[PDB]
Design an enzyme around this catalytic site. Sequence first.
Site, PDB file in Angstrom:
ATOM      1  N   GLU A   1       0.762  -1.227   0.000  1.00 18.30           N
ATOM      2  CA  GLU A   1       0.000   0.000   0.000  1.00 18.30           C
ATOM      3  C   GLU A   1       0.797   1.284   0.000  1.00 18.30           C
ATOM      4  OE1 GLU A   1      -2.996   0.066  -0.532  1.00 18.30           O
ATOM      5  OE2 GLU A   1      -3.770  -2.008  -0.065  1.00 18.30           O
TER       6      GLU A   1
ATOM      7  N   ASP B   1      -6.365   6.586  -4.862  1.00 19.80           N
ATOM      8  CA  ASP B   1      -5.872   5.240  -5.055  1.00 19.80           C
ATOM      9  C   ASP B   1      -5.898   4.889  -6.555  1.00 19.80           C
ATOM     10  OD1 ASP B   1      -8.449   4.370  -5.669  1.00 19.80           O
ATOM     11  OD2 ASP B   1      -8.610   3.017  -3.987  1.00 19.80           O
TER      12      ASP B   1
ATOM     13  N   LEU C   1      -9.042   3.639   2.745  1.00 22.95           N
ATOM     14  CA  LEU C   1      -9.996   4.331   1.853  1.00 22.95           C
ATOM     15  C   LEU C   1     -10.883   5.297   2.587  1.00 22.95           C
ATOM     16  CD1 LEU C   1     -11.533   4.709  -0.732  1.00 22.95           C
ATOM     17  CD2 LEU C   1     -12.971   2.849   0.012  1.00 22.95           C
TER      18      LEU C   1
ATOM     19  N   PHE D   1      -8.104  -6.975   2.765  1.00 27.08           N
ATOM     20  CA  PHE D   1      -7.781  -5.592   3.007  1.00 27.08           C
ATOM     21  C   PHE D   1      -7.992  -4.740   1.773  1.00 27.08           C
ATOM     22  CE2 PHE D   1      -5.356  -2.604   5.699  1.00 27.08           C
ATOM     23  CZ  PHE D   1      -4.973  -1.660   4.738  1.00 27.08           C
TER      24      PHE D   1
ATOM     25  N   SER E   1     -11.735 -20.088  -6.744  1.00 24.09           N
ATOM     26  CA  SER E   1     -10.373 -20.110  -6.240  1.00 24.09           C
ATOM     27  C   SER E   1     -10.385 -20.500  -4.790  1.00 24.09           C
ATOM     28  CB  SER E   1      -9.769 -18.724  -6.201  1.00 24.09           C
ATOM     29  OG  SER E   1      -9.839 -18.130  -7.473  1.00 24.09           O
TER      30      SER E   1
ATOM     31  N   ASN F   1      -6.333 -19.772 -11.468  1.00 19.83           N
ATOM     32  CA  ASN F   1      -7.678 -19.255 -11.442  1.00 19.83           C
ATOM     33  C   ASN F   1      -7.707 -17.833 -10.891  1.00 19.83           C
ATOM     34  OD1 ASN F   1     -10.508 -19.128  -9.741  1.00 19.83           O
ATOM     35  ND2 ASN F   1     -10.598 -20.223 -11.714  1.00 19.83           N
TER      36      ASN F   1
END
Length: 162
Positions: free
Chosen positions: A11, A20, A32, A104, A117, A132
């Site tokens: 991040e 972002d 966020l 996250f 998946s 996948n």
Amino acid sequence: MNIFEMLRIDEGLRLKIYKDTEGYYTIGIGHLLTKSPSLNAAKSELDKAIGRNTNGVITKDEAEKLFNQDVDAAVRGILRNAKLKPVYDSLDTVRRAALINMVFQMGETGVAGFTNSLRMLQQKRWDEAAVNLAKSRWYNQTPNRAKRVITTFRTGTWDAYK
Ligand SMILES: [Cl-]
Ligand SMILES: [Cl-]
């Protein structure tokens, strides 16, 4: 290596409000603020989160505090999610960190959506799961980060982060 360190590499850290990868207002270590395209709406969410008039700037400490809360939330969210928890419970420590990172970034809901998946991960079909997961908007939009998390799931090691 640990989850905090991993996410910190993924991040980064910015002390001023920024957009972002999707163009949403964010601050700190991927926190966020809002999806609204108004800067004011962001500044207000920001001061509400920090508890002071920030004017769109926070300190390092304040960033790390939001990060600690966000990691805690992610874990909790996973543990609360009927689709996710069983997957998490089945995994080793390193791979659990990879699931947390995804949660996250995209939220519990988006992750829970990778049905196939998830299933592969639960069955420990590493190479398949990795292929996948790659067929996703997630990988196409943020490919370097996605490769890193994917390799983590594939290997059960931190090499992608070394
Ligand atoms: Cl918050
Ligand atoms: Cl990326």
